[PDB]
Amino acid sequence: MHLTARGLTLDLSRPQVMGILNVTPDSHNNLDQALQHAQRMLSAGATLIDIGGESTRPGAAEVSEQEELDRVVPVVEALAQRFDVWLSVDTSKAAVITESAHAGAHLINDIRSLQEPGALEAAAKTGLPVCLMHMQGMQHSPYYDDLMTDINRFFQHHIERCVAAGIAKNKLLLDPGFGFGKNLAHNYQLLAHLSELHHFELPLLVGMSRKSMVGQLLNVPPQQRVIGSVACAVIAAMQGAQIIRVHDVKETVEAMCIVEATRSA
Amino acid sequence: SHMHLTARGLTLDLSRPQVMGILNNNLDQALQHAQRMLSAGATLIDIGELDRVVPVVEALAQRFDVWLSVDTSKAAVITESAHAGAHLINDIRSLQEPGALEAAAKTGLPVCLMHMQDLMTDINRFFQHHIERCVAAGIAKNKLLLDPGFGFGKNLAHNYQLLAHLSELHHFELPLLVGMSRKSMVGQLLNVPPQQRVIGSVACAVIAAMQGAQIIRVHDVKETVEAMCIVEATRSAK
Ligand SMILES: Nc1nc(O)c2nc(CNc3ccc(C(=O)O)cc3)cnc2n1
Numbered sequence: 001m002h003l004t005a006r007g008l009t010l011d012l013s014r015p016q017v018m019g020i021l022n023v024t025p026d027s028h029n030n031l032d033q034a035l036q037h038a039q040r041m042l043s044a045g046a047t048l049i050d051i052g053g054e055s056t057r058p059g060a061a062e063v064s065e066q067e068e069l070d071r072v073v074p075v076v077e078a079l080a081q082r083f084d085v086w087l088s089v090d091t092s093k094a095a096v097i098t099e100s101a102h103a104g105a106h107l108i109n110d111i112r113s114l115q116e117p118g119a120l121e122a123a124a125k126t127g128l129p130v131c132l133m134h135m136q137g138m139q140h141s142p143y144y145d146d147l148m149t150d151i152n153r154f155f156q157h158h159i160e161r162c163v164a165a166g167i168a169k170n171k172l173l174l175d176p177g178f179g180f181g182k183n184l185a186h187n188y189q190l191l192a193h194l195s196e197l198h199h200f201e202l203p204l205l206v207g208m209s210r211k212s213m214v215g216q217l218l219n220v221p222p223q224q225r226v227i228g229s230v231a232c233a234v235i236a237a238m239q240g241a242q243i244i245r246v247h248d249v250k251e252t253v254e255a256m257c258i259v260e261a262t263r264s265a
Numbered sequence: 266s267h268m269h270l271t272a273r274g275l276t277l278d279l280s281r282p283q284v285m286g287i288l289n290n291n292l293d294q295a296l297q298h299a300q301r302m303l304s305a306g307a308t309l310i311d312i313g314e315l316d317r318v319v320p321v322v323e324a325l326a327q328r329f330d331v332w333l334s335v336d337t338s339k340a341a342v343i344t345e346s347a348h349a350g351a352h353l354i355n356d357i358r359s360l361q362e363p364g365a366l367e368a369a370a371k372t373g374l375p376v377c378l379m380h381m382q383d384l385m386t387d388i389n390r391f392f393q394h395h396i397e398r399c400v401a402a403g404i405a406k407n408k409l410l411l412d413p414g415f416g417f418g419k420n421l422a423h424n425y426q427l428l429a430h431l432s433e434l435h436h437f438e439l440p441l442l443v444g445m446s447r448k449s450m451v452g453q454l455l456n457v458p459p460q461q462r463v464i465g466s467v468a469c470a471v472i473a474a475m476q477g478a479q480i481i482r483v484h485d486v487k488e489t490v491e492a493m494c495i496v497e498a499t500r501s502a503k
């Protein structure tokens with residue numbers, strides 16, 4: 001319905017687009033490029049920017065606290081001084097949660113739902129809203145007896161593990177984790193039954209943008225997955241997903257306009 | 266009700282969303298246009314003065330193996346194009362032109378009705394009324410297709426009121442064809458020229474198909490077909 005952070009509120013009356021700002025290889029300072037990209041997504045109509053410096057697509061190895069901080073935390077500083085936008089950090093490290101909060105992050109986006117050591121206490125201590133992600137968890141054929149029950153149970157579990165650590169239930173966001181331990185069938189069943197997760201009375205955030213769930217249906221490169229990614233965005237928005245995490249902000253934002261105009265007539 | 270449609274000895278499976286490419290030596294450039302749409306993923310090609318000898322239906326009939334539809338109102342243009350080898354008749358003015366009602370009955374190919382000026386009530390009763398005529402003077406019910414006529418004597422508000430309530434029209438147990446591609450209902454929201462109206466047209470199309478609309482009439486075939494897989498995959502998981 002709304003979000004609260006660092007004095008600012010965000011409107012979940014209508015679907016909100018989050019621009020992915022990855023900071024791994026930028027390809028002219030690397031910060032400069034990040035800032036230009038951020039800028040371009042704001043213009044386009046994102047009202048949140050997700051800053052990630054973790055090569056979290058399967059394989060490709062891992063990252064250490066010190067390396068993530070150096071890559072992530074400057075851009076957090078830079079954007080915060082520069083623009084008025086919800087800034088989100090996708091990280092699982094207590095240190096990156098800590099230092100990014102000081103830097104002016106508005107939202108903690110954790111694909112590991114604070115499972116990492118002290119992450120939970122670091123998160124709680126910032127008083128900032130947290131997004132939790134269903135993951136099935138290392139190379140394994142995903143399987144569920146019943147996918148939605150499993151997602152419902154996972155969230156139930158982690159909402160409580162958060163509410164006991166001191167994070168108000170209304171700091172919490174839920175993301176069912178498209179493409180995380182989910183085959184193609186699973187992803188579309190989850191898309192299909194998305195509206196069901198509205199029962200926790202928390203906002204939903206979803207990320208389908210240029211994922212293999214579009215690639216494997218349309219058999220195209222990531223940069224040619226714009227339309228399908230958008231079509232996913234439209235299907236989720238019609239089921240009342242509050243926040244859409246995307247690469248292609250301009251297209252998606254236009255798309256949400258049609259959705260909102262349709263949800264108003 | 267799982268659906269299919271048969272015409273001129275050919276079958277069109279309507280249990281999933283179908284994309285119909287709009288169409289408008291210059292005859293070579295049109296024939297080249299069709300091919301692009303065919304390879305994009307069209308399964309119907311909608312071909313749009315007193316005399317316009319359209320041998321393009323003839324060209325396409327002969328050239329390809331794909332549904333051919335024509336949006337036309339006049340009593341002559343319907344029959345001659347069947348001679349050519351068409352599969353479907355698309356009329357905006359729902360056969361109001363003298364003769365056409367009967368002219369389209371002697372050719373034995375599918376027909377498409379289109380609404381033209383409580384908004385939904387008005388449309389429904391209008392439709393119900395007009396379906397009565399077609400059974401009354403020649404053509405059996407399972408040969409009719411229903412177009413709501415987006416942007417035809419309709420306010421922006423209203424068009425979105427329509428799109429929102431589109432699922433309701435499945436109570437006549439006839440297939441729907443919608444046309445919203447690069448229309449004013451999109452342009453006035455997004456404040457952009459037609460070429461840049463792709464994404465908004467595709468967004469309408471998804472919203473239409475999520476509501477079981479079986480045929481979508483588009484300028485932007487590749488994008489729309491792409492979008493209908495995402496839609497079909499979603500509806501198949503259900
Ligand atoms: N909240 C949130 N939600 C996500 O969905 C997400 N995804 C990634 C990147 N993850 C993936 C996963 C799978 C795939 C594929 O199968 O292609 C691609 C990218 C990073 N942060 C994320 N954060």
Ligand SMILES: Nc1nc(O)c2nc(CNc3ccc(C(=O)O)cc3)cnc2n1
Binds near residue numbers: 412414417442447
């Ligand atoms: N089956 C079918 N269904 C249509 O909806 C359609 N529309 C047109 C073109 N009609 C319009 C009407 C309004 C507008 C605008 O307001 O922009 C644009 C085009 C031509 N053939 C059509 N055929």
